[PDB]
Every structure is written in C-alpha cells, then in structure tokens.
Amino acid sequence: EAPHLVQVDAARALWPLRRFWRSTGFCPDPYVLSWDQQLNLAYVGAVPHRGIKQVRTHWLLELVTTRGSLSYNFTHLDGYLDLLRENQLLPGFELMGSASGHFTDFEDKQQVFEWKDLVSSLARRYIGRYGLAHVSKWNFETWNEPDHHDFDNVSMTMQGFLNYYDACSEGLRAASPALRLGGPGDSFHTPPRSPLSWGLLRHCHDGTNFFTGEAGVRLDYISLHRKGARSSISILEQEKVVAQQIRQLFPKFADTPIYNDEADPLVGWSLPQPWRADVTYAAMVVKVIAQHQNLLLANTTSAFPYALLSNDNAFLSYHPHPFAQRTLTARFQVNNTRPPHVQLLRKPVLTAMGLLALLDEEQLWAEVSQAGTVLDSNHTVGVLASAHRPQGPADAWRAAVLIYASDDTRAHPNRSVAVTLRLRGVPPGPGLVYVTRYLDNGLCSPDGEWRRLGRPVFPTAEQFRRMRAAEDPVAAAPRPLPAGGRLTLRPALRLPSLLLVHVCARPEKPPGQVTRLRALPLTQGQLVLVWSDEHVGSKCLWTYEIQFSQDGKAYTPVSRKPSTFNLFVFSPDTGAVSGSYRVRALDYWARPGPFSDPVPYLE
Template sequence: RFRSLPVYNDEADPLVGWSKPQVWRADVTYAAMVVKVIKQHQDLLLGNPNSTINYTLLSNDNAFLSYHPHPFTQRTLTARFQVNNTHPPHVQLIRKPVLTVMGLLALLGDTQVLAQVLTSGGEHSDTLGVLASSHRPAVLGGSDSWQTAVLVYNSDDNSTSNHTDEVTVSLKGLAEQKGLVYVTYYMDNNVTNPYQLWQNMGCPDYPTAEQFRNIRNVEDPRVDGPFKVPAGDTLTLKAKLPVPSILLVHICAQPRAGPDQVNGVRFTGITEGQVLILWSDYCVASKCIKTFEVEFSTDKQKFRRINVKDTIFTSYVYSPVDQEVGGLYRVRAVDYWGRPGPYSLPERFSKTE
C-alpha cells in the first residue's frame, strides 16, 4: 500500500551531530564516504528492479556553516572563516573535498549501466566501489553528445590507511561511438586537501589573502586529458588508489557544435580587493567542458583571463595582489576539443557593491 509513497531521506549522514568536529569530515575521507553512500542507495533501492520503495531524495544534511575553531572538521560543504581583523570583518568560504566531489557526481549521466569490482581472485572488494552511467542527447546536432562516466572510489568509511590498491578500469561497448575523448578527475588526501595545507600554515584563525589564494589552489581534483580514446570497443586504464581516493573517467563523443553561452554572471563582494564571481551553465548544454574562462577588463576594450587554472566549477574568487577588482567581467565555456562558446554578456562590478 505504500509503494507509491515517495520516501525522502534528508538525514543520510553517517554520524549524528553536525557540529561535532571530526578530522575525517575535513578531507577526501568524507567525500569518498558520501560517494559510497550514494552508490549503496543507488544499487539497493533505485537501481534494483525488485525494490518496492519509491526512493525520491537522498541528502547528507551538510549544508551548515562551520564556526571557530573548527572551520573544516564539522559536517559542512565549505570551511567558513570569520575574519575579524579587517574593517569591516568579513567571511571567507573554502570548498571542501565533499563539495568538490559533488561537482564530479554532476558529470554522471542519467542512465545507470552495469559496473562491478572484482579482485584478482574473483572476489568482491570491501573498500572499492564503482558507479557507472551513460547519457544520450535528446536532440542531435547541438552542443550535447553521447557520454559515459565511471566513478571509482576507495573508501573504508571514516578510516584512512597507507594501503593502496592497483586498479584496472575497463570500459566496454565504445566501438559504435566516433570521435571519443576521455578526461580523468582524481582526488586523494595529497592532491585535494585544503585542510592539510591550512594545518601546514599553522592553522591561522585569520589567513592572509595570499594564504587564502594558496588554499583555494588545492580545492580542485587533479585533471588529466582530454586524450583520444584508442580505436576499438574497450578503453583500459590503470590507476593506484589509496584509502581514501576517488577517480572519475569521463568519455565524450564530439558534438557538432561547441558549447552554448554562459549566462547569469553576478557578484558577491567579499572584502576590500576581493570578489566572488558566479555564473550559470544552464544554457551551455554540455557536460564535456574543459574549463570556464573568466576574463576581466577595466576599460571595456581589452579583456584578460584571470583564472589561470582550469575549472569546471561555476564560481571563482578574484583576489589580485593589487586589489583592483572594479571593472567588467565575462565568462565563456571551452569544451574538451578546445572550442570556446560565446562569451556571457559583460557585467560590471563596482568596489562599492
């Protein structure tokens, strides 16, 4: 009688008490655990043809704002710093690995496909898991294209270890697609770990602008590619995955058109000489995006790119040494084949905002 009743689980986090500081909540340990929980729910409830539960929502209930002295270790998506040594005081937010991995999860397609993990002895692994998907465009000839994504995680729940698994990832059924390229995204506690860098700085209560720039420089996963997929039916990749770690392989067929226009450019002033730039990729119509390029101009004539490091995330904190942030901004998407989309409409940020 309850099969049609939608079930919402908005408390799926593995530990009660969002404000309870736990070191594993600060780094990739938590990110890999979230992926593991999603994978388990997907297999047991959503992807199981025998399931009788109308499972509608899974939430980790982690959209809190941390407070001193625990900027990284509470159940949050960002590390929040209340910086009180400026006039007026201001807030800085750092993207934690758990939020970064949600950006990788967004690269998954809309159809789950068969994937399994087998050890060399033919047994199932206790810590390794995989979630695979595919996507077919609703309309041919545009910016969208056939895609598949495979997300592999190595998680021992809230534990870390020195153990590393040597993994071979094999993706089959590629022969009928043409012009394929692939990109890999990788996270572990040595690559994507703002918390560790903050600790190495001495855990400053009020990091300097330069320290915040360095911390943000390790928010993203390591990205390799795009590379051409060799001819044939199967792509085989080898990787070494420590506990914890996450590897996503994203394969795209080349669409006929490049990405569409970025829109919705807007700003949030952070403090003197710092601005958060945000935009929307809703109309870009492609997930095969190598980067968003953010450009800045003071005179409407000459724009220059200000985010030197590639990013697939739709925000950027501009914090130049000279503190000159007033001017025009525009953003465009560049796809895996190096084709840029049209620039967004230029928007002006004033120092008074």
C-alpha cells in the same frame, strides 16, 4: 587492499540512473539573510549541472511576523526564498515555526484554522512570485523531528500534531492541488517509540480529516531520518527495515515515495571530526550513494519506492573548527580586517557533488572483483558508471565512470589500492576523448593545506590562495580514445580517493552561453564571480574562461587553474578588481562557448 579489477561495459546500458541525491539542508537581520549565508548558497548553487537542487531549511516560518490578532509580514521569507531562487535552488519547505510567537497550541481550534489560512496565503504568495510550475517542484514538509519535541513555546501533543498536519494539507490544497506535502521527518523506531511518526501514517491511512471529516488524509511522500553511526551500509540497512514495516502495516502506502532527508554518516553536525574535513567525508558520501543505487534501486526484488537522499551539510562552520564540522564549505571569519569579512572554502565533499553531477541518465553494467571474487558496493572499492544518449547538436554521447575507495570514516594515510580499469563497448563516434579527475587527501585537501600553513586563524590573502589551489580535483588534459572503444587504466588509488573517468564524443556545435553572472564583494581587492550553466548544453567542459576589462571595453584572459565549478574567487596580487567581467565555457576540444553578458564591478 589487494588488486581490484573494475570492468565497465559501455555497450550494456541496464536501466535509468536517477539523480536522487541532489539535496542538502541546514538549521539556523536573520541568520539566513547574512552575507555568510549569501556566499554559502552561491557555493551550493555553483555545483555544475544542478548538482544540488534542494536546500532543506528549518524554521522558515520564524521568518514570518504577525499583525493584529490577522495578517502576515513575509519580508524576511521573501528575502530567503529570493536568495534560493537567484542561486537556482529549491527550498525543502518545512512548515516549521510559530510566525514570531503567534502560534502556541494546535489543540486550540482557532489556531488550527489560522494555521491553514497562513499556509494557503504563503503558498499563493510564492505561486504568485515564482509561478505555479516552479512552486510545484518544492517539497513541502511537516515540522522537523516531531518525536524529538523541538517546539519553541509551541504545544504539540499527538492530537495537536494531527490537527497541525490537516491544516498543512488543507492549506496547501486550497492554494493548489499540484503542491506536494510529506512527513513526518523522523526516525520511525520500533513501537511504542516514535509515536508521532507512526501516528501520522495511521492518521493519513485511516484517520479523520480535521476540516472535512473524511477518512484518510493526503500524504505525498514519507520522509524519515536515518544516520549511519559511522557506517555507510548501516544507513541503507535501517532504511529497508523501516520501509518493510511501512509496506506491511499500510497497504495504501505501497507505492508512496520514501525520502531520507537526513542521511548522514553521523549525528551532530557541529561535533569536530577529522574525517569530515576532507576527501574521507567526500568518498564516503559517494559510497553511500553507490550503495543505494546498486543495492536498493537497481533491479532489486524488494523494489522499495526510495525517491530521495539528502546529506544535511549546508550548515556554516565556526571557530575553532573551520573544516572539521559537517559542512559543504569551510567558513573563515577574518576579524582583523577593516571591516571584518567572511571567506568560504570549498571542501572536498562539495567538490565530490560536482563529480556525482557528471553522472548521466542510464546506468551501465560494471563489475568490481578481487582475485575473481565479485564485490558489491558493500565494500571498500566500488563504482557507478553511466551513459548519455545524444539528444541535440549541442551534445553527443557520454560515459562517466566514478570509482570510490572508501573505508567509511577511517582514513589510512599509507593504504592504497592497485586498480585495473577495463572499459569496453564505447560506440563509434566523432573525436572521442577521455579525461580523468582524481581526489585524495595528499593532493586535494584545503584542510591539509591549512595545517601545512600552521592553521592560521585569520589567513592572509596569499594563504587563502594556497588553500583554494587544493579545491579542484587533479585532472589530465583530454586524451584521444583508442579505436574499438576500449581503454585500460592502471591507477593507484588512496584510502580515501575518488576517480572519475569521463569519456565523450564531440558534439557538432560548441557549448551554449554562460548566464546569470554576478559579482559579490568579499573584501578590498577581492570578489566572488558566480554564474549559471543552465544553457551550456553539455557536460564535456574543461574549464570556464574568465576575462577582465579595465580600460574601456577591451577584455583580457584571467589566468587560472582549470575548473568546472560555477564560481571563482578573484584575488589578484595587485588588488585591482574594479572593471568588467565576462565568462565563457571551454569544451574538451578547445572550442569556446559564447561569452556571458558582461558584469560591471566597482569597489
């Protein structure tokens, strides 16, 4: 690329910047209760500042068994939802499954009534288990892709699907009107394609409710699936076409929120793609989000009610493609140990979600130009800039500027961009500093490190350490901001790359306490420490300091690369891991937060 000027005006807040992208998903002693999945969700929950909130999960009702011919056993569903709750995640609760073979036909009147009973009983159960306010946040959803006809020995016709929906809607209503239901979770192709999709909208708009006979049925949001076929802008372009058609065909759905809860670059999660392994995927993901913010949600004339975007990448990878599949983590099943164990590696895409999470509530004015020509996000180089207004003494003013350099699925190992970043209008404040974080394939690719090591199928302890050293972005220590609230940077960015510039004033109080610390075993001499940042109170963190106590209760530092990710795999050279651990936050001014409550561990 030729030289790019990126201008940010921190004195010019424009409108809200909603964090609409904080979702993932996957499709499966059940698979969801395995140690693999328990590690996976710890990693998903370890993205700082609720970077991922929703996990859209298929086949949740295959976790339920039936007794008689009528009660339900929820044990396996309890387990999975408890697992999500523990990681402070929410289910994208697809009402999908046959309750272990009980449900077979949704034109059978008896079964339609039984389905409603099941939905009400499960919603009431989890309202009881977690509280109404918590379950009210859950997106309940119809069966996935009803036009792809993926029903396991379940008969679902046009009419059956409508009856099934009414049972869903009425079931949730009986439990609480506060609970939210949407669908159909399909593509909405040009009619007569996607009949079950357009049929749901028509039924909700004008159709007869199966249970009550009234015209029209509740539909809290419309969820579609649009993939880009390797193009980022293509996702947004297809979405606008579908939203416009809905707007014009359904007057009542004018303000009904639209979700794209499978907005991936490419169909087929398990297909190996080199670009899925590294910062190429990461950068494209940011690019898609920047495109949706700037070209759809920001002051647009269209004003389509776009509410949620979900990357469907919580899947677990398999041999022989640990890195090359559409997944947030790279999974290594190390079978040559006694017993065999599982290791997860954080992929750049997961790290990039942590950079996105640093974005705040107001979008700042920013301009990207090339030799005087202004370029929108429909280009190789783009930007999202945000600001935070101080609320409590635990936080002060912040700005976060995320620059991407991405040519979608194409990586260019030679290609680089000369960028001039010009930031102005940072308001006066105490102890103003800036921190840069940078990702690219040369420096921050665990996959690149894996290949550098000869692609060991069963990596050694040291090989895992080396690969984990490439998870975090390269970061410069905090530098004091020059007076006048201005900064010029001339970085060289690769294709692909991400660059986050974080500018922060000094809060009056140090960070809050780390909470919910736990220790999960990996294998002999190794464990994962995971914690919550719910109460730290600010995003201006350099690292989380970890301490270890062997002897009695005297704690000593555990030396490590700085990281803000709420998880650390502890793998000392001595293998000595039994004892107590505590974690505290450290801010940009070297001020520590209070230590978490200690957690005991014994092999």
